[PDB]
Amino acid sequence: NMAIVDVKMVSGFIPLKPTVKMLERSNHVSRTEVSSNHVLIYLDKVSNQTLSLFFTVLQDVPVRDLKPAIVKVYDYYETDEFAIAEYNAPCS
Numbered sequence: 005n006m007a008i009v010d011v012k013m014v015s016g017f018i019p020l021k022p023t024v025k026m027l028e029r030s031n032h033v034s035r036t037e038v039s040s041n042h043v044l045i046y047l048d049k050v051s052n053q054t055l056s057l058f059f060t061v062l063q064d065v066p067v068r069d070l071k072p073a074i075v076k077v078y079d080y081y082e083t084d085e086f087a088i089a090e091y092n093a094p095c096s
């Protein structure tokens with residue numbers, strides 16, 4: 005019935021408050037938070053129709069080459085059934 009989404013960041017960059025704040029105030033979002041660059045968006049309930057999420061991540065450390073970070077999505081009840089999906093940076 006319920007679910008949670010994790011997002012590990014590449015090298016070292018975080019987002020701003022008017023983009024993190026704007027996520028909790030939308031359909032299916034319980035809490036938006038970041039635990040040591042793991043940008044977790046706490047989803048409310050699971051649904052068949054597609055739901056899109058978005059925000060701006062500001063580049064701090066410009067020492068870059070080619071590393072795509074991970075995305076996780078496991079339900080709040082049974083954490084064994086999830087789906088991985090690595091995303092690459094816009095420059096890499």
Ligand SMILES: *[C@@H]1O[C@H](CO)[C@@H](O)[C@H](O)[C@H]1NC(C)=O
Nearest residue numbers: 005006049050051052053054
């Ligand atoms: C989701 O999909 C199933 C069929 O795949 C459907 O029976 C159901 O009504 C849909 N919605 C919910 C809330 O389960």
